[PDB]
């Protein structure tokens, strides 16, 4: 590697997602997905272990077959009414394959088998960029193609994604698998609204991206990957404890805190239809996926685990890390309760 080479490759990730955003054509969208894949491979395997090698293998196979299934759906769309415009499709079967391909692309619960396995054995920068941009890219396409989708697919993937992202993690102690299960749950929440009012989906996308950036930045405050390392972060610095506390509780979704705002407004514009069984199921599982958050909190923020010396040795040294933009994103991502009428900023 070189820093210039990384400038170029991250520039191409930016360019690929922008080409996904910007074109009215299908080929450029598929090229954007492919360039996203090709450029996001070398961000993984930034170190040199076979863990990242197998993770990159799993990611490449699932990512590739999702792109190929998408291209199949587009060519079926031109087997029916023939144009390369990004609008309503003209086949239940092509839309069926397209939603399944995008579901493998981002990760739903039938297709979520690769996400924790790829997010464990990688460095944290690779995981952050894959989570943010790989959940940012297909939602643009779904926002554009929404009026041709049978609701059974999006509804089933959303319900199943929320419940499997809830039920996974309760045995899990690796923090990357915890955050990946949280990603599955929030993508289910981001999916279950799209046939009703997509403004909520893109708003939940913005909120989840800012929360994930704050989360992985406070995991990059020092080299930590397990909970016992977070107990050592307790005994080495007090401010990291309360910041991890507040960001975890905003991922939990509690009303005086900013992460409740995507939940409740989704419940509102859900229930202006006659959907009641779906909000109560989704919200009971949103109660369920708070327990692993809460046991992480109970572990390393409010109880006081016994620590190990050479933290005495670590006390002499300043935190000379770099933060990309930590405090701005943190207090913007936590105290954002009374700015709920910034819903309409999204048009």
């Amino acid at each position: 590697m070189n820093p210039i080479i990384l400038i170029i490759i991250l520039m191409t990730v930016m360019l690929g997602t922008i080409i996904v955003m910007i074109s009215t054509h299908w080929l450029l969208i598929w090229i954007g997905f492919e360039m996203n894949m090709l450029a996001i491979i070398p961000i993984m395997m930034k170190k040199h272990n076979p863990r990242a090698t197998e993770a990159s293998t799993k990611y490449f196979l699932t990512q590739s077959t999702a792109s190929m299934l998408l291209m199949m759906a587009i060519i079926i769309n031109l087997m029916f009414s023939g144009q390369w415009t990004v609008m309503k499709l003209f086949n239940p079967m092509a839309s069926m394959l397209m939603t399944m391909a995008l579901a493998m692309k981002l990760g739903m619960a039938p297709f979520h088998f690769w996400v924790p396995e790829v997010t464990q054995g990688i460095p944290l920068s690779s995981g952050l960029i894959l989570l943010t941009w790989q959940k940012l890219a297909p939602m643009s396409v779904l926002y554009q193609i929404l009026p041709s989708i049978n609701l059974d697919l999006i509804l089933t993937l959303s319900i199943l994604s929320i419940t499997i992202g809830g039920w996974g993690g309760l045995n899990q102690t690796q923090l990357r698998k915890i955050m990946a299960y949280s990603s599955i749950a929030h993508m289910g929440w981001m999916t279950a609204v799209l046939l009703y009012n997509p403004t909520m989906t893109l708003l939940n996308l913005i909120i989840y991206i800012i929360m994930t950036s704050t989360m992985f930045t406070l995991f990059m405050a020092n080299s930590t990957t397990t909970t016992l390392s977070l107990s050592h972060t307790w005994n080495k610095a007090p401010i990291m404890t309360i910041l991890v506390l507040i960001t975890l509780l905003s991922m939990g979704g509690l009303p005086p805190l900013s992460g409740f705002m995507p939940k409740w407004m989704i419940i509102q514009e859900m229930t202006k239809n006659d959907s009641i069984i779906l909000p109560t199921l989704m919200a009971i599982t949103a109660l369920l996926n708070l327990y692993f958050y809460m046991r992480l909190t109970y572990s390393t923020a409010l109880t006081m685990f016994p620590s190990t010396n050479n933290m005495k040795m670590k006390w002499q040294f300043p935190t000379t890390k770099r933060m990309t933009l930590l405090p701005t994103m943190t207090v913007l991502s936590t105290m954002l309760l009374p700015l709920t009428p910034i819903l309409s900023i999204l048009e």
């Binding site: 935190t319 405090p327 009374p338 910034i342 309409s344």
Partner: protein, 119 residues
């Protein structure tokens, strides 16, 4: 609610946003954003081991200024969007007046209801 005349691309502050009263000094929402900026700079000094409430005073001033600037433009776009929602609503009222009849506003001298005695 979809665009609604994207002809006229995304356009972060449109032309008709100057055809409506902008927000003013000491409005409470921008004051909230300013306190959020003060807390932002304070917690930025709280990240590193530099002392709180000191030695970041230019960072205090810069963060507060930047957040007030951003939030001011966001408030302008917000009021534009609510105003254009209002105009679209009343214009659809004007387009189909026949579909929305005036309901039978009876006075309560002639309204029969049920009583359901609790005891």
């Amino acid at each position: 609610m979809t665009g609604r005349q994207a002809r006229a691309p995304l356009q972060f502050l449109p032309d008709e946003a100057r055809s409506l009263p902008p927000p003013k000094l000491t409005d409470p929402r921008l004051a909230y954003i300013g306190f959020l900026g003060y807390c932002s700079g304070l917690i930025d000094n709280a990240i590193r081991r530099r002392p709180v409430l000191s030695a970041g005073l230019h960072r205090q001033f810069l963060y507060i200024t930047s957040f007030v600037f951003v939030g001011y433009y966001l408030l302008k776009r917000q009021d534009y969007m609510y105003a254009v929602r209002d105009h679209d609503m009343f214009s659809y009222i004007k387009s189909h007046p026949e579909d929305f009849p005036e309901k039978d506003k009876k006075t309560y001298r002639e309204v029969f209801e049920e009583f359901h005695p609790v005891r």
